[PDB]
Amino acid sequence: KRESGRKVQSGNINAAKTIADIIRTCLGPKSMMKMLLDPMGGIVMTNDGNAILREIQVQHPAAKSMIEISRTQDEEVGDGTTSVIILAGEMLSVAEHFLEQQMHPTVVISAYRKALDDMISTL
Amino acid sequence: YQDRDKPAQIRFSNISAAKAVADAIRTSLGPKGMDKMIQDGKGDVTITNDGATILKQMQVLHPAARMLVELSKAQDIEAGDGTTSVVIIAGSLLDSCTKLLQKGIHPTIISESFQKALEKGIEILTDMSRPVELSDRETLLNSATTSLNSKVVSQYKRALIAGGGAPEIELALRLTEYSRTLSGMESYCVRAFADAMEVIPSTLAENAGLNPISTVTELRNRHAQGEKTAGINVRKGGISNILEELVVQPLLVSVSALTLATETVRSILKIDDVVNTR
Amino acid sequence: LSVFGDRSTGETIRSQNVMAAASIANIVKSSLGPVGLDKMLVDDIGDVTITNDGATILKLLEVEHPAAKVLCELADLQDKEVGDGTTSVVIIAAELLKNADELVKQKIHPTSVISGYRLACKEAVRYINENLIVN
Amino acid sequence: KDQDRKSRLMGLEALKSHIMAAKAVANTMRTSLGPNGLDKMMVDKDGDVTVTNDGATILSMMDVDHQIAKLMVELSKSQDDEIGDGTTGVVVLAGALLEEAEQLLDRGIHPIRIADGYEQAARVAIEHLDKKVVYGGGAAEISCALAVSQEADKCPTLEQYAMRAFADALEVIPMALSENSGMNPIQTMTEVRARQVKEMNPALGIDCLHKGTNDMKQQHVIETLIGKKQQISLATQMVRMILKIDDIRKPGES
Amino acid sequence: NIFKAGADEERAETARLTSFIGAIAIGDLVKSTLGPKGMDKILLSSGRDASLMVTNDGATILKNIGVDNPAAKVLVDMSRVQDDEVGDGTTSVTVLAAELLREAESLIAKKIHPQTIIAGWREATKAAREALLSSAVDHGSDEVKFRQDLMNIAGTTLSSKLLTHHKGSGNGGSLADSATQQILDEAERSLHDALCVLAQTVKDSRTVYGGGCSEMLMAHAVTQLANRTPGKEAVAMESYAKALRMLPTIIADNAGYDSADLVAQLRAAHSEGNTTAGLDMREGTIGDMAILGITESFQVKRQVLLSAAEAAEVILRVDNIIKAAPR
Amino acid sequence: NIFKAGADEERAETARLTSFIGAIAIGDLVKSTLGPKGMDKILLSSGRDASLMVTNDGATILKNIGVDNPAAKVLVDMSRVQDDEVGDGTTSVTVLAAELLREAESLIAKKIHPQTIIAGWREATKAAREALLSSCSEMLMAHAVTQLANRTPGKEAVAMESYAKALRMLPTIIADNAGYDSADLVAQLRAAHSEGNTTAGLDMREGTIGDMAILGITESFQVKRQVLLSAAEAAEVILRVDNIIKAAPR
Ligand SMILES: Nc1ncnc2c1ncn2[C@@H]1O[C@H](COP(=O)(O)OP(=O)(O)O)[C@@H](O)[C@H]1O
């Protein structure tokens, strides 16, 4: 029906983290392949991060946002899309400071937005 | 006793269904009556406290309970006021009958006894009323204006009586004295008729935040010492002299209520059983 | 009693309407103020309208409950009359019900509670008007 | 220690449960009231068999394990040394006052307030009585009920409902003699009361032995004034002692 | 494969129960309506709500209720004949017949044959009929007295009706001014019922005292006849008297009075002269029916006695109901 | 915890059933033995197979059989008094008292008080004794009681009939045990005694009605008087009881 409280943020993290764990090994020239069981018993052995998530069914809306943001990347840039989801999943995978330390997301978001201005300058 | 045949189960079946309709409509009595939520089958929901509108939107299926619904319509046609007070009075008389029937009293003796209380009851209310002149358009203006202030719009039997359940206390007080002079089963049957009237002011006191018992218990002493002027004043939140507050109602409302309610109780008491035809 | 529907009475009906209004408030409680957190709105089709504005949430919030719909009708009164403060209204009204419901458990009639809240709003508007600053 | 399986019940559910036990002891003895009372077949632990209607002997053999009922028996142990005759009248009246009190608990009266109401009415009754001495056969109970009913109107407080209940409870003794005699109790109750007002002011009793008529003064059936004074006093004192108990705690065996 | 697929047969053990249980049920259905203090009854057809109504007429209750039992249909048809033909006694016939079968079921339990029961009831009905004939009082002269009797008989027929509050061949406003058609329809029915017995009273000026006087007088003659009779006929005739005594017992029970006291007092009254005592529903005691002004026609009580005995006689003669496969 | 550890108390209707069934059970136990054609009965003790025996004496049946309920002990103890004091009519006392209680149980179901029934039985016992002095005997006493039922107040009339009806069951049981049609013989005696013929009775030898004066059958007056009184007195005790108080076994 609906979700409320700390279950939401920890749930959105596991959804975004799970989508990134699929395509963790789809990075680089020695990328690994993936086996997609079709409903008719068929298989597609693609190794493209965009094609894998396009064919996978997702129930969490957080996963739909991660996938829909990746499609917007492909229209602008046909490369580096797999790096977006992996970094977004790793940045969210640090749930120690998020919930176990009882920090508010505004404290975390202020740090993530401060680092982004520093990451841009360093590059 | 054996009590093989049990036609009394239909009396308790009709009394419970009749008392159920009164217990629901009880809280909506008076200006401070607690509202009620009605939900139509389509999905719409509404809020109201008018007892007449609630009974129509109840979809009553029991025969005995339908008699209280048709009873309330009779009060609207005759008097047009006191629609909710009638159903509350009938529910308490039938609830009081449940105590008398367990004692081994017949419904016919209870029915004939209640008529004697009704006959003496109309004399009690008529004696303590305030006659007025009908040609005097001054009394009719302030009478409807003050009464219309209790209605929704506050800005825009030649007799009168006080409100706040004071007629029910003088009725209940003197009927208990009248029962002491009676003989036979009519004593307990008329006393039970008197105690049933106390449900109205105790309901008004409950809605006004007061204690239901101490309010009617205090007023029964003020009526023994004073007159019917003593009644519950919800505008101020306590007992006050209702004659000074100008909160009155005509005599036909209280008389037609006891008249039509008692006839329904006598009619429901005379039901021995119901037969399903085809 | 036999009827073509269903009925339910008692103090639990007040509690059911209290917990309902309290639920609607929690949907727009964390999104209060300029630092309010965004919230998803999963429509029937599948679209997801993400926003933190309390007024925009209540317009799209669909909870099939009568008590919640009273606060939705209440939102339109505040939006048209002023156009702001709808979020604080639903939150203030929810706490008054959660506190009043506790008084009802202490044998305090709702009529006495309704009378107290009316006088408190009158005096509150007086203390507010006495402590303003003109433009 | 032994908190497991401990008795735990309070509020109206406990008082009504206590009142339920006292009524069983009263209803058991309400039929054995008077000369037309129904006997009670007592079987001893040794296997003996005895039959009698003595109120004192019924309570001594009645080994009720309920604690509230034991207090009803301890009350009667003292009555045998003061009154002697109306041992059933005390228990029957106490059960009547508790039965009428149950109607007041639903109205929202406190047990201690009912206790104060009965103590006030018990003084009105005691004041009115002096006005195998007083006239028995239920004449005193009916006369006291009329005085308590009139004086109840002069009680502007929640004890007014309790004073009225004391009048109706007083009528159970005469109403019980009429039932045990094979007559309509209520019709015989009200007819005697109306005769105490309409026919003549002096008190008149019930003709339980099916003699000529009422007015037990002619039948020479008269009870002691100290008897009736202690009868309704011990009955009220037992009702107050039971109304002022709302917790029976007993540790269970684990 | 004796009786299957709709076709049924009740053996002597069960048909003896089904025959009485069907007839006794119709009696206990409308016995409460007996007397001026009769109890009302609701009638509500299944599947429709507009058929609601309330009444205390024993005839109207039997006309509308459907009956599947054949034993009950005989007792109901025999009652409708009394309503259409005589106009009074529809309830007493149904109650008197059912009370006879109720006692008969206790007799057959004692291994008393139904034919042995019928022999006693035929002799009792003759002695019972002879009692009314001797106690009946005609009025050839004194038209004032005969006119007064018609007024008393009219009140008895109109008792327990809607109107209870207010010279030859017998071929708007409140009720006192003689509101809708339902009031006038029932006004015509009960009034026509009075004209039926009143017209019968002109053709037969004999009258008998009601209120349990006639029923108790006939029951006394049967008990006297039980002294001079063979063995098994005595026990059967004793039940015929008890069935007649149960009529005032029901009139007193419906009114709330102690029926065991009033009815047993009437026995001691009629047993030692005093062939006028009856039930005084006004005060709730025993009084002379002549002084109180209560009386009923002789032909009405005659047909009530005979139609009730003839109805119960048909049920006892039945011992096995046969039901073929319904279409 | 109102009653535990062996002690118990029976309610009104519970003690009512326990009081009448316990007494009525002892009645039907010896009903078959009443009369010269009394049916035999076997008595077999526990743990002693050799104690098997057969008899038809009601006194021998009650002396050896045990009694658990207290109401039954009251009826069995009074039967032993008849066996020791009088020596005859023991079965008549037990059968007559149970028939009185069997009818009293029916009257209590009709909303009739036990004390009102005792008022009728006391009046009925007077008219029955007066009938014996003027004077088979079971029907003469029942005839006087039936006539007394027409000269009594309301509720007492019904109780007198049950007293007469109980006396009429004695020749019914005597005829049933002999195999004859008890309904014809007893109803013929009723029709006889109601109009003269105060000497008729049963003829178990020929199986019909005959004149006891001619046939030479008679019983002592003191025996029948005690059977009437011991039965009504014994039934009065059981009918007067409404609650049974069982104590703890020792
Ligand atoms: N030859 C290589 N050696 C090391 N890293 C590489 C090489 N080729 C690609 N990568 C890394 O793989 C990442 C993904 O590259 P690419 O496949 O072009 O984008 P995407 O995975 O989004 O399609 C880049 O960030 C790049 O750093």
UniProtKB/Swiss-Prot annotation, chain A:
ADP binds at residues 28, 80-83. Mg(2+) binds at residue 79. It comes from the Eukaryota. Belongs to the TCP-1 chaperonin family. Component of the chaperonin-containing T-complex (TRiC), a hexadecamer composed of two identical back-to-back stacked rings enclosing a protein folding chamber. Each ring is made up of eight different subunits: TCP1/CCT1, CCT2, CCT3, CCT4, CCT5, CCT6A/CCT6, CCT7, CCT8. Interacts with PACRG. Interacts with DNAAF4. Interacts with DLEC1. Transmembrane segments: none annotated. This is T-complex protein 1 subunit gamma. It is linked to Neurodevelopmental disorder with speech or visual impairment and brain hypomyelination: An autosomal dominant disorder characterized by global developmental delay, impaired intellectual development, poor or absent speech, and brain abnormalities including hypomyelination, cerebellar atrophy, and optic nerve atrophy. Some patients have severe visual impairment, dystonic movements, and seizures. There is a cross-link at residue 1 (Glycyl lysine isopeptide (Lys-Gly) (interchain with G-Cter in SUMO2)). Component of the chaperonin-containing T-complex (TRiC), a molecular chaperone complex that assists the folding of actin, tubulin and other proteins upon ATP hydrolysis. The TRiC complex mediates the folding of WRAP53/TCAB1, thereby regulating telomere maintenance. As part of the TRiC complex may play a role in the assembly of BBSome, a complex involved in ciliogenesis regulating transports vesicles to the cilia.
From Swiss-Prot, chain C:
Belongs to the TCP-1 chaperonin family. Component of the chaperonin-containing T-complex (TRiC), a molecular chaperone complex that assists the folding of actin, tubulin and other proteins upon ATP hydrolysis. The TRiC complex mediates the folding of WRAP53/TCAB1, thereby regulating telomere maintenance. As part of the TRiC complex may play a role in the assembly of BBSome, a complex involved in ciliogenesis regulating transports vesicles to the cilia. The chain holds residues 5 to 139 of 556 of the full protein. ADP binds at residues 33, 85-88. It is linked to Intellectual developmental disorder with polymicrogyria and seizures: An autosomal dominant neurologic disorder characterized by a broad phenotypic spectrum. Main clinical features are developmental delay of varying severity, intellectual disability, seizures, and polymicrogyria. Additional variable features are non-specific pyramidal or cerebellar signs, and visual impairment. This is T-complex protein 1 subunit alpha. It comes from Homo sapiens (Human). The gene is TCP1. Coiled coil: none annotated. It comes from the Eukaryota. Mg(2+) binds at residue 84. Changing residue 34 to L: In IDDPMGS; uncertain significance. ATP binds at residues 33, 85-87.
Curated annotation (Swiss-Prot), chain D:
ADP binds at residues 34, 86-88, 137, 207, 223, 228. Mg(2+) binds at residue 85. There is a cross-link at residue 1 (Glycyl lysine isopeptide (Lys-Gly) (interchain with G-Cter in SUMO2)). The modification Phosphoserine is found at residues 7, 254. Ubiquitinated by the DCX(DCAF12) complex specifically recognizes the diglutamate (Glu-Glu) at the C-terminus, leading to its degradation. InterPro entries: Chap_CCT_epsi, Chaperone_TCP-1, Chaperonin_TCP-1_CS, Cpn60/GroEL/TCP-1, GroEL-like_apical_dom_sf, GROEL-like_equatorial_sf, TCP-1-like_intermed_sf, TCP-1_chaperonin. Transmembrane segments: none annotated. Induction: Down-regulated in response to enterovirus 71 (EV71) infection (at protein level). It is found in: Cytoplasm; Cytoplasm, Cytoskeleton, Microtubule organizing center, Centrosome. ATP binds at residues 34, 87-88, 137. PANTHER family: CHAPERONIN. NCBIfam families: chap_CCT_epsi, thermosome_alpha, thermosome_beta. It is linked to Neuropathy, hereditary sensory, with spastic paraplegia, autosomal recessive: A disease characterized by spastic paraplegia and progressive distal sensory neuropathy leading to mutilating ulcerations of the upper and lower limbs. This is T-complex protein 1 subunit epsilon. It comes from Homo sapiens (Human). The gene is CCT5.
Swiss-Prot record, chain E:
It is found in: Cytoplasm. Its main location: cytoplasm. ATP binds at residues 35, 89-91, 296, 301. GO terms for cellular component: azurophil granule lumen; cell body; chaperonin-containing T-complex; cytosol; extracellular exosome; extracellular region; microtubule; zona pellucida receptor complex. It catalyses: ATP + H2O = ADP + phosphate + H(+). Keywords: Acetylation, ATP-binding, Chaperone, Cytoplasm, Hydrolase, Isopeptide bond, Nucleotide-binding, Phosphoprotein, Ubl conjugation. ADP binds at residues 35, 89-92, 159-160, 211, 296, 301. GO terms for biological process: binding of sperm to zona pellucida; chaperone mediated protein folding independent of cofactor; chaperone-mediated protein complex assembly; chaperone-mediated protein folding; positive regulation of protein localization to Cajal body; positive regulation of telomerase RNA localization to Cajal body; positive regulation of telomere maintenance via telomerase; protein folding. Mg(2+) binds at residue 88. InterPro entries: Chap_CCT_beta (IPR012716), Chaperone_TCP-1 (IPR017998), Chaperonin_TCP-1_CS (IPR002194), Cpn60/GroEL/TCP-1 (IPR002423), GroEL-like_apical_dom_sf (IPR027409), GROEL-like_equatorial_sf (IPR027413), TCP-1-like_intermed_sf (IPR027410), TCP-1_chaperonin (IPR053374). Its EC number is 3.6.1.-. Signal peptide: none annotated. SUPFAM superfamilies: GroEL apical domain-like, GroEL equatorial domain-like, GroEL-intermediate domain like. The modification Phosphoserine is found at residue 51. Belongs to the TCP-1 chaperonin family. This is T-complex protein 1 subunit beta. It comes from Homo sapiens (Human).
